Amino acid sequence: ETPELESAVRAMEAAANVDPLFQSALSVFMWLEENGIVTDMANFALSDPNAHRMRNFLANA
Amino acid sequence: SEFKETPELESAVRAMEAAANVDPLFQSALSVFMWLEENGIVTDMANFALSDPNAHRMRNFLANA
């Protein structure tokens, strides 16, 4: 309900609507946010900076 | 394999930075976006999310990393 949050979501949607890859990133953001794990994912990224562990997990799904 | 350099992208990054100034959610979001893009896993993660909509599998993975 902060003006910054509402403005950022509008701007992200505008970028997503002109680039499928950014749309995919926005979809990930919305999924992480709805599930309360955005900061948890950022913490994981610090532990796995080159995504070696994450790639293996995503691949064997 | 990288975000298209559009005027909308520059505006989105600026807006996310303004939100990161008031909400840690957007600090984390910027870091996650950069990490997904640099590692080439944006689409892979979006595809995973479709299979795990309530994040039960992802939460289990993050809990034990």
Q: Between chains, do B8 and A21 touch, taking CB under 8 Å as contact? A: no
Task: Check CB contact of A6 with chain B, cutoff 8 Å.
Answer: no
Cα A18 from Cα B49, distance rounded (Å):
21
Q: Is residue B14 a contact partner of residue B20, using CB atoms and an 8 Å limit?
A: no
Task: Check CB contact of B60 with chain A, cutoff 8 Å.
Answer: no
Q: Between chains, do A58 and B37 touch, taking CB under 8 Å as contact? A: no
Cα B45 from Cα A29, distance rounded (Å):
10
Of A61, A53, A16, A9, the C-alpha closest to B29 is A9
The residue length of chain B stands at 65
The alpha-helical segments, DSSP class H, found in B1-65 are: 7-20, 24-38, 42-51, 56-63
Q: Is residue A23 a contact partner of residue A29, using CB atoms and an 8 Å limit?
A: no
- Distances in Å between the alpha carbon of B6 and those of A14, A24, B58? 10, 16, 31
Task: Check CB contact of A56 with chain B, cutoff 8 Å.
Answer: no
Of A16, A58, A39, A23, the C-alpha closest to B39 is A58
Listed resolution, Å: 1.3
Within 8 A of B5 by CB-CB distance, chain A residues are: none
Which experimental method was this entry solved with?
X-ray
